[PDB]
Write a protein that binds this ligand. Structure first.
Ligand SMILES: *[C@@H]1O[C@H](CO)[C@@H](O[C@@H]2O[C@H](CO)[C@@H](O[C@@H]3O[C@H](CO[C@H]4O[C@H](CO[C@H]5O[C@H](CO)[C@@H](O)[C@H](O)[C@@H]5O[C@H]5O[C@H](CO)[C@@H](O)[C@H](O)[C@@H]5O)[C@@H](O)[C@H](O[C@H]5O[C@H](CO)[C@@H](O)[C@H](O)[C@@H]5O)[C@@H]4O)[C@@H](O)[C@H](O[C@H]4O[C@H](CO)[C@@H](O)[C@H](O)[C@@H]4O[C@H]4O[C@H](CO)[C@@H](O)[C@H](O)[C@@H]4O[C@H]4O[C@H](CO)[C@@H](O)[C@H](O)[C@@H]4O)[C@@H]3O)[C@H](O)[C@H]2NC(C)=O)[C@H](O)[C@H]1NC(C)=O
Ligand SMILES: *[C@@H]1O[C@H](CO)[C@@H](O[C@@H]2O[C@H](CO)[C@@H](O[C@@H]3O[C@H](CO[C@H]4O[C@H](CO[C@H]5O[C@H](CO)[C@@H](O)[C@H](O)[C@@H]5O)[C@@H](O)[C@H](O[C@H]5O[C@H](CO)[C@@H](O)[C@H](O)[C@@H]5O)[C@@H]4O)[C@@H](O)[C@H](O[C@H]4O[C@H](CO)[C@@H](O)[C@H](O)[C@@H]4O)[C@@H]3O)[C@H](O)[C@H]2NC(C)=O)[C@H](O)[C@H]1NC(C)=O
Ligand SMILES: *[C@@H]1O[C@H](CO)[C@@H](O[C@@H]2O[C@H](CO)[C@@H](O[C@@H]3O[C@H](CO[C@H]4O[C@H](CO)[C@@H](O)[C@H](O[C@H]5O[C@H](CO)[C@@H](O)[C@H](O)[C@@H]5O)[C@@H]4O)[C@@H](O)[C@H](O[C@H]4O[C@H](CO)[C@@H](O)[C@H](O)[C@@H]4O)[C@@H]3O)[C@H](O)[C@H]2NC(C)=O)[C@H](O)[C@H]1NC(C)=O
Ligand SMILES: *[C@@H]1O[C@H](CO)[C@@H](O[C@@H]2O[C@H](CO)[C@@H](O[C@@H]3O[C@H](CO)[C@@H](O)[C@H](O)[C@@H]3O)[C@H](O)[C@H]2NC(C)=O)[C@H](O)[C@H]1NC(C)=O
Ligand SMILES: *[C@@H]1O[C@H](CO)[C@@H](O[C@@H]2O[C@H](CO)[C@@H](O)[C@H](O)[C@H]2NC(C)=O)[C@H](O)[C@H]1NC(C)=O
Ligand SMILES: *[C@@H]1O[C@H](CO)[C@@H](O[C@@H]2O[C@H](CO)[C@@H](O)[C@H](O)[C@H]2NC(C)=O)[C@H](O)[C@H]1NC(C)=O
Ligand SMILES: *[C@@H]1O[C@H](CO)[C@@H](O[C@@H]2O[C@H](CO)[C@@H](O)[C@H](O)[C@H]2NC(C)=O)[C@H](O)[C@H]1NC(C)=O
Ligand SMILES: *[C@@H]1O[C@H](CO)[C@@H](O[C@@H]2O[C@H](CO)[C@@H](O)[C@H](O)[C@H]2NC(C)=O)[C@H](O)[C@H]1NC(C)=O
Ligand SMILES: *[C@@H]1O[C@H](CO)[C@@H](O[C@@H]2O[C@H](CO)[C@@H](O)[C@H](O)[C@H]2NC(C)=O)[C@H](O)[C@H]1NC(C)=O
Ligand SMILES: *[C@@H]1O[C@H](CO)[C@@H](O[C@@H]2O[C@H](CO)[C@@H](O)[C@H](O)[C@H]2NC(C)=O)[C@H](O)[C@H]1NC(C)=O
Ligand SMILES: *[C@@H]1O[C@H](CO)[C@@H](O)[C@H](O)[C@H]1NC(C)=O
Ligand SMILES: *[C@@H]1O[C@H](CO)[C@@H](O)[C@H](O)[C@H]1NC(C)=O
Ligand SMILES: *[C@@H]1O[C@H](CO)[C@@H](O)[C@H](O)[C@H]1NC(C)=O
Ligand SMILES: *[C@@H]1O[C@H](CO)[C@@H](O)[C@H](O)[C@H]1NC(C)=O
Ligand SMILES: *[C@@H]1O[C@H](CO)[C@@H](O)[C@H](O)[C@H]1NC(C)=O
Lengths: 211, 213, 234, 471, 129, 240
């Protein structure tokens, strides 16, 4: 129906279970899939891993029937945070088309990162096109839990705010952008506009004003 | 044969006869057993007495044995025409083999004499291609077993290539014999008559066939 | 050894024929098996079917009624078609190289062994959406430098406003600029249009006339609009 | 020379008579698992040694086909079977309609068979009479016949195979079927004569003859086509038949060196005890743990093909006919066309088509080593059997937990001629064991029953002091 | 040994006659179980064997040969039974073939055996003692 | 009531060895000894030895102890008290004084004082030791002759001339006519060859319905001569 979660501390070992355990002799596959990228199989035959896959991954064989196929990852890295699929093929159940239910891994104990905020006012060409949008870009923060608020001088805007849900970038940190739609008269009117980004207990605020 | 028997002995028809068989004490019947066999010439012998007195299975009570400390005796009561043959004794222990005797020819006197049956056979035309010419004078059913044969060519005695056989006993208790005259085709074709003369004790018979015939 | 390159339209109307192409380079198509797997938002990845080197098709039971997989002999590329698509078929489509697998657990003469498949090599995957909405070319408005942080560095940007559908590929001077580039995820405004922003952090000293030009490419709308960035003025 | 009859009491004189012998099996102990059908309460422990007395200057007629020890061992096997089936739980209430379904099996794709295990559910009585309980159990297809439909691999309606011919009685879990060494002993006034000729045919006079108080260790092994765990013929490979020219009766083959046959059931099964009455706990087959394989038997192809070669030559001896063609049986009855036997509880039925598929010429007309490619035999399994002839009523072989593996040494064959073809054009042979007694004859050929007559009236040269003689 | 002189001549067989008479019944007194109808055949054999003993003991009972194995009789030998001598019986024939040669009669030899003596002896024992 | 059949007559050169057989039937071969006794023309009977088939016992005479080896095979049973065996006597370095008849005999008793005593003798084996090679016989027809004019009996035969060594076996109609047959002993011709004749006396009326074929067998030379007697006679006494 949906994806099952899991959390493993940084630097420790991760034993990821496989749903619907086999009913006989089995040849399972362990696939690694990060959102937006190509899936990679960590394991293709319980024990075997192709060249290029690190030695930290290992799968339990079926030398004695009754063992649950577990994916063991020794020394969890920040890059190991992804979705893991368990493709189950056994001698009892027939053709197994569907992959296993995804297992969302989350790495705990990561160092927190303060949000880097860059606020950009509506450009001159956009204002010339009778449109305005304040662009508050948040990058390089951890964890991905931020709340964006907008301020005119000191009054909340509360309207016309479009916010992106955070997403992890190449730095293994999170990033999210926030757009505030305004007409050129509203942007030209007030003294200064401010973007407040609340991250953990902190709140980083950046202010821009018309020229 | 150190175990010596009587050379010949005779008894009357319907009477009895005794056969002796003795030898040195190292072989004789002080610590030995005596067996009696009937061994006709040209046949297989037949056990008639075994272990001194007891007779072989199925033997008539006419035969009997009597063993002394120095000799063994075989009595054959009620003599029959088939009893006229040779008999042998054997001195044996439980382990050592038979020690045969010299032999005894038993004659049964007081019987009726028989007439000789003589037939002279000329050499066939196939023998003259060999080439030989042998006259075959056959005699049979005569009694007793003694004859005297003589050949003749054109009423003249012949003494070359004569070969006569000793008398043999027929199954009819009579005797038979044969004589042969070997000749070359010249002597064959050189006379007018060939004759076989069989002479007995009571009657002399002659049969003649011509060579040219 | 083998490299794959997906290529598709990006938007197909409902109840139509979704056609995607997969280009091969390393080896011939008559040497390996080939699988197609789609991944839709809110769900997992779905194996839809595979084709052998012997041109024998096999499909998933749910899509067997609407899926067709083929391979081209002259050109090293395989094709995927899906008739009568709806808004549920919107997904990122991957093609993969499938190797065979023989799992023996008993006597071969009796049988007692089953075949399985694993796909080691994948492609980048092409995102495909399906709806009655029309195409939309992205507007480009450059974000002038703030001239931002303390002495040392500053940030400039390129605004890609109101387009449809995903995705939009952004570069800077056709790849001449690479270090410090960050392309933020687009937002879906309530109008039904996406909007992304790109930023680069360059030193404030290198702002005489280096002229950072941002190149926007959106193949669904055939629009390839570039834009220059100049500092402030006024 | 005066003979008188005299009585001698104890003269070695015997005559052929048929009297009932008795059992004697050497002392074998087990404190936990008791009640051996062929041993416990069926036989008795014997002495440490049954002496064999060689009889000199004796040549004794033997006849294995007119023997009475075989006709006694047959009825003793059947009677021990029915005695084993008396106190156990019977399966009269197991005659309820069955809803059977197919069992999970992965797609396939040479040609072979497959004993479709059926997962059957049914309403069954419980410890209470008025109340019931729907339970499931795994049954082999051969133990069940349908009523309607079948056709889909979905549900339909089924019926146990026995529930009309005769009610069935489950086997006790305590009793064991393993054949134990059984010695047949003769009572007082009788004796057993043993023929010690190594190359002895079926019947006729035997030269080297002895007498014994009891026979040697004979294990009552029941089988078909292949007789195993028996004795080995010393010297030559022996062919024993009541009548070779008779096309109908069988022919027994006694081998000079046994051949290995290894039989395994690879299904790590499970046992599920369900109540079907007060104290009655019917044991059914639980779900098969692990893969779904079929039982089989491996036989060394080198030793088997050499054995069939030598048997082919021994058949070429008694037959100045033509090429010795070997085939499988004609077909029809499953228990006739299969090498059927037991392997600790489970009853195996093997298809020996790959074994009997040879043909050897008198001219030879026209090799090397091939490792040890053991000829594999697909062997199915039955749980409700009615063999031992119809006299022996059925029994539900209770499921055996875990996998099964049993070794065996085949020491002979049970062949049958074909006939119908032109004589000496081509001779055909088919395995089979249509009669139960032939399994015992192959071990009771070297024995005979005799009755002692100690009265001997013989004449001697001696008379008793008749009446008036004392003083 | 038991039946060890079955192929030997009647002279070497008549020596050991206690051996065939021992194992003709000797169910040992043990001095050191049964159940079911299947274990009744055993009993029926025992009884049967016992009868086999107590029948021969009965014949030897009416023949005046109770306690001894060998015994002489007052019945004379008949010439029609066999035409064999002493060395033609006790050193040429086994008890088997001899009993086969006499098997046409015996029953007459048995009637005379219980009639020619013990029917006349017991009559001439009340009239004597 | 057994049966001891010996091998056929044999010719051997001086210095060689020969092995005579003695196959039995109709009795338990292991129950009686096998005796070998020879008879020569000059010395009469002479017991050579006996051998036990059961125990392997052998007793040889001191004269034949140096050049005679006796063996026996194991009996092949037929019934419970009958079997078939064979005995063999191998004699080496033959001389002319060894020429004669050889008999194997079956023992009288199994146990007693005369167990080995020869009782059931065989037909005999004629052994000839000579330097002259074998010579086959020449058979010539003996035409019928008159034996009785009133009784109507004639005598017809066959002449066996020049053969070596002895003997020669004669039959009529392949053994289907042994009544009234008389075979005369062999003569010793001047050249050393043997010759005999076989005659039969038959009614003269049986000429068209009775076959007259004298079967002559000389097995030493491996030759057999089956002759049809010529039924054309020149005797006038018979034609009356
Ligand atoms: C009566 O007679 C009957 C027959 O006549 C007889 O039936 C026999 O039964 C037995 C079992 O009872 C059967 O034995 C089985 O055999 C299976 C197959 O084994 C063969 O193949 C493997 C694999 O070889 C491929 O891979 C290697 C490595 O990549 C390559 O180098 C090879 O070239 C080959 O690759 C080719 O083939 C591929 C397809 O398979 C192609 O894709 C590829 O392109 C290539 O073309 C070999 O390794 C085997 O060799 C081994 O055994 C031989 C002796 O036979 C040794 O000499 C040799 O040194 C090796 O040790 C062999 O050639 C086995 O897979 C099977 O064992 C698995 O299953 C059991 C039960 O489920 C498990 O308990 C067990 O643990 C095994 O699982 C392992 O393997 C799976 C799949 O790989 C893994 O997923 C799993 O995790 C586990 O991994 C283990 O092994 C790994 C190494 O492989 C190791 O790294 C891991 O760490 C882990 O330890 C079983 O043994 C036999 O086949 C039957 N006979 C026949 C003819 O079928 C019956 O018993 C008789 N009855 C009696 C006697 O009573
Ligand atoms: C099965 O049937 C067979 C056949 O029917 C039967 O065998 C017969 O058994 C009987 C005994 O019951 C035998 O008869 C006895 O023979 C005794 C032999 O005496 C000795 O002499 C033998 C000859 O030796 C001579 O030659 C050698 C070498 O040339 C020389 O050195 C000697 O000095 C001598 O000159 C000899 O072969 C024989 O050997 C036997 O015994 C030795 C041990 O002593 C053993 O080593 C051998 O292997 C062999 O077994 C022996 O040494 C004879 O003594 C005996 O006479 C006694 O009894 C009679 C009454 O019966 C008394 O009157 C007499 O005084 C003696 O006390 C008796 O004659 C017969 O020969 C057998 N026949 C055959 C064909 O084998 C089996 O016994 C039967 N078996 C069964 C179980 O039924
Ligand atoms: C032809 O001949 C072959 C050769 O004998 C026959 O093969 C035999 O089959 C029978 C079944 O029909 C087997 O008996 C069963 O064996 C199993 C397996 O466990 C036994 O064997 C193990 C090795 O294979 C052994 O390790 C086991 O225990 C040993 O160690 C313990 C101590 O730890 C010791 O106490 C033992 O004595 C052993 O030394 C064990 O023996 C077993 O599970 C079965 O047990 C059940 O039945 C017995 C009956 O006595 C009972 O006592 C138990 O309580 C339990 O109820 C049973 O013994 C036999 O093992 C096979 N032979 C061999 C050599 O393995 C073949 O069957 C014959 N053919 C035919 C047609 O009969
Ligand atoms: C008739 O059969 C009997 C038995 O079947 C044969 O007796 C057997 O004879 C052999 C040797 O001839 C004996 O073998 C020997 O055994 C001893 C141990 O006792 C051993 O030390 C030797 O090395 C040898 O192996 C065998 O034991 C014996 N049988 C019995 C039961 O004692 C007899 O030989 C046969 N007769 C013929 C003529 O073959
Ligand atoms: C088994 O072999 C025996 C011989 O050892 C056979 O017995 C003889 O067989 C031949 C023909 O082969 C017959 O002529 C004889 O009459 C048989 N003799 C006896 C005493 O039976 C026996 O026939 C063979 N068995 C079979 C079934 O052929
Ligand atoms: C006992 O075994 C021997 C073989 O060791 C048998 O002897 C053979 O018997 C047959 C007749 O059945 C003959 O054709 C053979 O020539 C014999 N061989 C030898 C080597 O003698 C003997 O027959 C057997 N006795 C039986 C079966 O009673
Ligand atoms: C006995 O079996 C052999 C082998 O199965 C038969 O030989 C086969 O004959 C057929 C003719 O119908 C050929 O097509 C096969 O090639 C032969 N087999 C082999 C291995 O060459 C033989 O015909 C059988 N005997 C009879 C009487 O049918
Ligand atoms: C036993 O197995 C053999 C093969 O393992 C079966 O023989 C097959 O029979 C069918 C029809 O009779 C043929 O179409 C196949 O070609 C045969 N197989 C082979 C390998 O020749 C046989 O039928 C089986 N026994 C039973 C009773 O079904
Ligand atoms: C008997 O064995 C022979 C030899 O293996 C089998 O003959 C083969 O049959 C197949 C087709 O059935 C042919 O393709 C092969 O060429 C044959 N020979 C060999 C050497 O494989 C035959 O099928 C077997 N018969 C059975 C099992 O019933
Ligand atoms: C099956 O046969 C094998 C060999 O053919 C038997 O193994 C023998 O066992 C005995 C012990 O009784 C050993 O003395 C031998 O050395 C073994 N043979 C070998 C080659 O090692 C095995 O016992 C037989 N199984 C049975 C009769 O059940
Ligand atoms: C064997 O059977 C044939 C006919 O099938 C019959 O003529 C013969 O007498 C039988 N032989 C025996 C010993 O039963
Ligand atoms: C019989 O067995 C012996 C010894 O094991 C062996 O040498 C011989 O080859 C075998 N012969 C046959 C025909 O089985
Ligand atoms: C086999 O039988 C045929 C006809 O039945 C016959 O012609 C042939 O001679 C026989 N061959 C033998 C007996 O060896
Ligand atoms: C002997 O037996 C015959 C029968 O053959 C009988 O007539 C006769 O009376 C018997 N004699 C005696 C004395 O019993
Ligand atoms: C006694 O032995 C001889 C010679 O072996 C035999 O002919 C005869 O049948 C035997 N039995 C007798 C005479 O009762």
């Amino acid at each position: 129906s949906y994806v099952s979660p899991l959390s493993v501390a940084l630097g420790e070992t991760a034993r990821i279970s496989c749903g619907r355990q086999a009913l006989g002799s089995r040849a399972v596959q362990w696939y690694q899939h990060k959102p937006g990228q190509a899936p990679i199989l960590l394991i293709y035959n319980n024990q075997d891993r192709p060249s290029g896959i690190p030695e930290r991954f290992s799968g339990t064989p079926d030398i004695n029937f009754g063992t649950t196929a577990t994916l063991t990852i020794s020394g969890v890295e920040v890059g190991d945070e992804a979705d893991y699929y368990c493709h189950m093929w056994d001698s009892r159940s027939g053709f197994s088309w569907s992959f296993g239910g995804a297992t969302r891994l989350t790495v705990l104990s990561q160092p927190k990162a303060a949000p880097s905020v860059t606020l950009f006012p509506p450009s001159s060409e956009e204002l010339q096109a009778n449109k305005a949008t304040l662009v508050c870009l948040i990058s390089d923060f951890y964890p991905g839990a931020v709340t964006v608020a907008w301020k005119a001088d000191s009054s909340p805007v509360k309207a016309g705010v479009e916010t992106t849900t955070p997403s992890k970038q190449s730095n293994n940190k999170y990033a999210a952008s926030s757009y505030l739609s305004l007409t050129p008269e509203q942007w030209k009117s007030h003294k200064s506009y401010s973007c407040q980004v609340t991250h953990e207990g902190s709140t980083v605020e950046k202010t821009v004003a018309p020229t | 044969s150190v175990l010596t028997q009587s050379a010949s002995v005779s008894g009357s028809l319907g009477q009895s006869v005794t056969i002796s068989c003795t030898g040195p004490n190292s072989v004789c019947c002080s610590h030995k057993s005596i067996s009696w066999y009937q061994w006709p010439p040209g046949r297989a012998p037949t056990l008639i007495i075994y272990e001194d007195n007891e007779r072989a299975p199925g033997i008539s009570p006419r035969f009997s044995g009597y063993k002394s400390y120095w000799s063994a005796y075989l009595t054959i009561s009620d003599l029959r025409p088939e009893d006229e043959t040779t008999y042998y004794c054997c001195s044996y222990t439980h382990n050592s083999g038979c020690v045969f005797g010299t032999g005894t020819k038993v004659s049964v006197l007081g019987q009726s004499k028989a007439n000789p049956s003589v037939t002279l056979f000329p050499p066939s035309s196939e023998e003259l291609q060999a080439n030989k010419a042998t006259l075959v004078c056959l005699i049979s059913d005569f009694y007793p077993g003694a004859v005297t044969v003589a050949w003749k060519a054109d009423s003249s005695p012949v003494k070359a290539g004569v070969e006569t056989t000793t008398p043999s006993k027929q199954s009819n208790n009579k005797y038979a014999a044969s004589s042969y005259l070997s000749l070359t085709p010249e002597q064959w074709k050189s006379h007018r008559s060939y004759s076989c003369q069989v002479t007995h004790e009571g009657s002399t018979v002659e049969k003649t066939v011509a060579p040219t015939e | 050894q083998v490299q794959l390159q997906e290529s598709g339209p990006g938007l197909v109307r409902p109840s139509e024929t979704l056609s995607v192409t997969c280009i091969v380079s390393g080896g011939s198509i008559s040497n390996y098996y080939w699988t197609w797997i789609r991944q839709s938002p809110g769900k997992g990845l779905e194996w839809i079917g595979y084709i052998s080197d012997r041109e024998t098709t096999t499909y998933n039971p749910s899509l067997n009624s609407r899926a067709v997989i083929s391979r081209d002999t002259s050109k090293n590329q395989l094709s995927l078609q899906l008739r009568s698509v709806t808004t549920a078929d919107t997904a990122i489509y991957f093609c993969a190289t499938a190797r065979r697998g023989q799992r023996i657990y008993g006597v071969v003469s009796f049988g007692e062994f089953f075949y399985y498949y694993y796909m080691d090599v994948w492609g980048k995957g092409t995102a495909v959406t399906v709806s009655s909405a029309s195409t939309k070319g992205p507007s480009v408005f450059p974000l002038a430098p703030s001239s931002s942080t303390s002495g040392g560095t500053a940030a400039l940007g390129c605004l890609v406003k109101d387009y449809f559908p995903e995705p939009v590929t952004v570069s800077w001077n056709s790849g001449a600029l690479t270090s410090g580039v960050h392309t933020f995820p687009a937002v879906l405004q309530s109008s039904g249009l996406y909007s992304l922003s790109s930023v680069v952090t360059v030193p404030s000293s290198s702002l005489g006339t280096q002229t950072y030009i941002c190149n926007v490419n959106h193949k669904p709308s055939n629009t390839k609009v570039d834009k220059k960035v100049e500092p402030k003025s006024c | 020379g005066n003979l008188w009859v005299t009585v001698y009491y104890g003269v070695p004189v015997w005559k052929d008579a048929e009297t009932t012998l008795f059992c004697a099996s050497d002392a074998k102990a087990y404190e936990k698992e008791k009640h051996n059908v062929w041993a416990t309460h069926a036989c008795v422990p014997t002495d440490p040694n049954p002496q064999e007395m060689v009889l000199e200057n004796v040549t004794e007629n033997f006849n294995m086909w007119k023997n009475d020890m075989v006709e006694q061992m047959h009825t003793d096997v059947i009677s021990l079977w029915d005695q084993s089936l008396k106190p156990c739980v019977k399966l009269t209430p197991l005659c309820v309609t069955l809803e059977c379904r197919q069992v999970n099996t992965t797609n396939a794709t040479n040609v072979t068979n497959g004993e479709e295990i059926k997962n059957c559910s049914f309403n069954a009585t419980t410890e209470l009479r008025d109340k019931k309980q729907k339970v499931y159990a795994l049954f082999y297809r051969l133990d069940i016949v349908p009523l309607e439909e079948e056709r889909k691999g979905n549900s339909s309606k089924y019926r146990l195979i026995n529930c009309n011919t005769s009610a069935c009685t489950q086997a006790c879990p305590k009793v064991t079927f393993d054949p134990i060494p059984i010695h047949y002993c003769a009572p007082a006034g009788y004796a057993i004569l043993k023929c010690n000729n190594k190359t002895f045919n079926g019947t006729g006079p035997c030269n080297n003859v002895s007498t014994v108080q009891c026979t040697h260790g004979i294990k009552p092994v029941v089988s078909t086509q292949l007789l195993l765990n028996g004795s080995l013929a010393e010297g030559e490979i022996i062919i024993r038949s009541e009548n070779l020219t008779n096309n109908v009766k069988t022919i027994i083959v006694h081998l000079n060196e046994s051949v290995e046959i290894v039989c395994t059931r690879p299904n790590n099964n499970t046992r599920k005890s369900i109540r079907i009455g007060p104290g009655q706990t019917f044991y059914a087959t639980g779900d098969i743990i692990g893969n779904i394989r079929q039982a089989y038997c491996n036989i060394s192809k080198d030793d088997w093909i050499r054995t069939l070669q030598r048997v082919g030559k021994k058949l070429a001896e008694h037959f100045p006919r033509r090429i010795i063609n070997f085939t499988s049986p004609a077909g029809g009855d499953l228990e006739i066309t299969t090498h059927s036997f037991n392997c600790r509880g489970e009853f195996f039925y093997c298809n020996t088509s790959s074994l009997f598929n040879s043909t050897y010429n008198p001219n030879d007309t026209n090799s090397s080593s091939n490792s040890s490619l053991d000829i594999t035999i697909p062997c199915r399994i039955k749980q409700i059997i009615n063999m031992w002839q119809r006299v022996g009523q059925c029994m539900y072989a209770p499921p055996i937990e875990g996998n099964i593996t049993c070794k065996s040494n085949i020491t002979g064959l049970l062949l049958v001629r074909d006939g119908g073809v032109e004589s000496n054009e081509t001779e055909i042979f088919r395995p089979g064991g249509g009669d139960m007694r032939n399994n015992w004859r192959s071990e009771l050929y070297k024995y005979k029953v005799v009755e002692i007559k100690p009265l001997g009236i013989a004449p001697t040269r001696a008379k008793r002091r008749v009446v008036e003689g004392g003083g | 040994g038991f039946l060890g002189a079955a192929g030997s001549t009647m002279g070497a067989a008549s020596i050991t006659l206690t051996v065939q008479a021992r194992q003709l019944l000797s169910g040992i007194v043990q001095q050191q179980l049964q159940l079911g109808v299947w274990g009744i055949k055993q009993l029926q054999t025992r009884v049967l064997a016992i009868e086999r003993y107590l029948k021969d003991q009965q014949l030897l009972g009416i023949w005046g040969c109770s306690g001894k194995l060998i015994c002489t009789t007052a019945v004379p030998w008949n010439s029609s039974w066999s035409n064999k001598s002493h060395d033609e019986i006790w050193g040429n024939m086994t008890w088997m073939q001899w009993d086969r040669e006499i098997s046409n009669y015996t029953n007459t030899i048995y009637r005379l055996l219980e009639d020619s003596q013990n029917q006349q002896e017991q009559n001439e024992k009340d009239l004597l003692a | 009531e057994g049966q001891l059949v010996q091998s056929g007559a044999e010719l051997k050169k001086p210095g060689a060895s020969v092995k005579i057989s003695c196959k039995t039937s109709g009795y338990r071969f292991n129950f009686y000894h096998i005796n070998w006794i020879r008879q020569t023309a000059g010395r009469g009977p002479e017991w050579m030895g006996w051998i036990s088939p059961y125990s392997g016992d052998k007793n040889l005479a001191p004269a034949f102890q140096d050049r005679v080896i006796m063996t026996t095979d194991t009996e092949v049973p037929v019934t419970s008290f009958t079997s078939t065996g064979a005995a063999y006597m191998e004699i080496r370095n033959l001389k002319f004084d060894d020429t004669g008849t050889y008999f194997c005999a079956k023992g009288l008793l199994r146990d007693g004082s005369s167990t080995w005593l020869p009782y059931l003798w065989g037909q005999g084996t004629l052994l000839t030791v000579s330097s002259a090679s074998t010579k086959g016989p020449s058979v010539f027809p003996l035409a019928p002759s008159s034996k009785s004019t009133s009784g109507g009996t004639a005598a017809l035969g066959c002449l066996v001339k020049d053969y070596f060594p002895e003997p020669v076996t004669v039959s009529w109609n392949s053994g289907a006519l042994t009544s009234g047959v008389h075979t005369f002993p062999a003569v010793l011709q001047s050249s050393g060859l043997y010759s005999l004749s076989s005659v039969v006396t038959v009614p003269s009326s049986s000429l068209g319905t009775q076959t007259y074929i004298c079967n002559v067998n000389h097995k030493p030379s491996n030759t057999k001569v089956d002759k049809r007697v010529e039924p054309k006679s020149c005797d006038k006494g018979l034609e009356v």
